[PDB]
From a paper:
In the classical nuclear import pathway, importin alpha recognizes cargo exhibiting a nuclear localization signal, and this complex is transported through the nuclear pore complex by importin beta. IMPα proteins consist of three functional domains, an N-terminal IMPβ-binding (IBB) domain that mediates interaction with IMPβ, ten ARM domains that recognize and interact with cargo, and a C-terminal CAS domain (involving ARM 10) that mediates nuclear export and recycling. The Trp and Asn are absent in ARM repeats 5 and 6, resulting in the segregation of IMPα binding regions into major (ARM 2–4) and minor (ARM 6–8) sites. There are seven isoforms of human IMPα, grouped into three subfamilies that exhibit specificity for specific nuclear cargo.
Numbering used by the authors: 80 to 503
The structure:
């Protein structure tokens, strides 16, 4: 507990007792798992007193201890970080980034990171205090690995968030620094940078173009094969987000030789990586016919069909999305190739699952295949849809019929349309 002597000494006038009491507060606040944050911040003027000590540029130890206590306070709930923010500490921490004491600089970086990572509200508060430029200047002139780690972590926190997202113009001046950071060897640095890039690349294609222009694609594709999962996972997220852009932006990643790496990742021992790789490939196959041809020539679709009929439902949903996108924008010959691999049966087997989204994707895929079957039957003049009999051999016709009683309107309206147009 905080003693009445502690409070009296914190507000004393002798720097010695001030430092001793601030150190006592910091040590109590650094206690886990239940720090006494509420008791401290509920003591009136104590947080204000720490923020006042932050301005004691003559005492390096008092500055450092007060900054550390405020960091511990900011490591709690949002309402406990609000007290640090409302005391006016963010502008002081951003000016302490240029302190002559390296300890104070690192502690201020850690505090601003904690504050920025509490919520999107605190993130935008810190950004609107003009932190990016001082932070980027400190990150380029750092002589401590731990300080660079903390600074990159705080930068990532400044870039994270989608509800709401940060104003891109306030976080995009950092994309040059992250591109250079991707060339380091520290796994923590690479991981935080990849997370920042994954969030900066999640959005409209203009943000993706900004990320591409920084020249990060080759390095991210290389990091896809990183041994440390904490680095490969965010890198795969970033690549998958990038391949959601137009066909040129996706072609950049494809030219970074990403399809072979994605193929290897499809055989990962972790279902999360397999799901994310399937999702990336589905974004790719949603592109033009050249990128679908690239996925074909990469020998990826056989593995996707295996996944479609053996993996977990979360991964099979993405594999089905990949196959269906391929059938949607592919040529008759490419879809003939997909059918020759035996995709109709694993797609029909998914019409009986509880996830209505998987059912809808499978239905759309079968619909595309049947549409091209009808077109080819027209060209032949025989009226023979060659792929109708294949859906019959899969015992999928009665599955489509059963889907007319589904609760989802999209599914049961799509099930009636198929039976009416193709199965007459």
């Amino acid at each position: 507990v905080i003693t009445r002597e502690m409070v009296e000494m914190l507000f004393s006038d002798d720097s010695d007792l001030q430092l001793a009491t601030t150190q006592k507060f910091r040590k109590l606040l650094s206690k886990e798992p239940s720090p006494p944050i509420d008791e401290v911040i509920n003591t009136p003027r104590v947080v204000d007193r720490f923020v006042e000590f932050l301005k004691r540029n003559e005492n390096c130890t008092l500055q450092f201890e007060a900054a550390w206590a405020l960091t511990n306070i900011a490591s709690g709930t949002s309402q406990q970080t609000k007290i640090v923010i409302e005391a006016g500490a963010v502008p002081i921490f951003i000016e302490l980034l240029n302190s002559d004491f390296e300890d104070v600089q690192e502690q201020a970086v850690w505090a601003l990171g904690n504050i920025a990572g509490d919520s999107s509200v605190c993130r935008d508060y810190v950004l609107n205090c003009s932190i990016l430029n001082p932070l980027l200047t400190l990150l380029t002139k750092s002589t401590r690995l731990t300080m660079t780690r903390n600074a990159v972590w705080a930068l990532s926190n400044l870039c994270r968030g989608k509800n709401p997202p940060p104003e891109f113009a306030k976080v995009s001046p950092c994309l040059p620094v992250l591109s250079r950071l991707l060339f380091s060897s520290d796994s923590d640095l690479l991981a935080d940078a990849c997370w920042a890039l994954s969030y900066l690349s999640d959005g409209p294609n203009e943000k993706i173009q900004a990320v591409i222009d920084s020249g990060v694609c080759r390095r991210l594709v290389e990091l896809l094969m990183h041994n440390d999962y904490k680095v490969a996972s965010p890198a795969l997220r970033a690549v998958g987000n990038i391949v959601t852009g137009d066909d040129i932006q996706t072609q950049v990643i494809l030219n970074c030789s990403a399809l072979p790496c994605l193929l290897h990742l499809l055989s990962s021992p972790k279902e999360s990586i397999r799901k994310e790789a399937c999702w990336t490939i589905s974004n790719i196959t949603a592109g033009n016919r050249a990128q679908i041809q690239a996925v074909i020539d990469a020998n990826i679709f056989p593995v996707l069909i295996e996944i479609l009929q053996k993996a977990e439902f979360r991964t099979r949903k993405e594999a089905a999305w990949a196959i269906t996108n391929a059938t949607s924008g592919g040529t008759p010959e490419q879809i003939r190739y997909l059918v020759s691999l035996g995709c109709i049966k694993p797609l029909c087997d998914l019409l009986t699952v509880m996830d209505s989204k998987i059912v809808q994707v499978a239905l759309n895929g079968l619909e595309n295949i049947l549409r091209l079957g009808e077109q080819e039957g027209k060209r032949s003049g025989s009226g023979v849809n060659p792929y109708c009999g294949l859906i019959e051999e899969a015992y999928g016709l009665d599955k489509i019929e059963f889907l007319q009683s589904h609760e989802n309107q999209e599914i049961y309206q799509k099930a009636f349309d198929l039976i009416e147009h193709y199965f007459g």
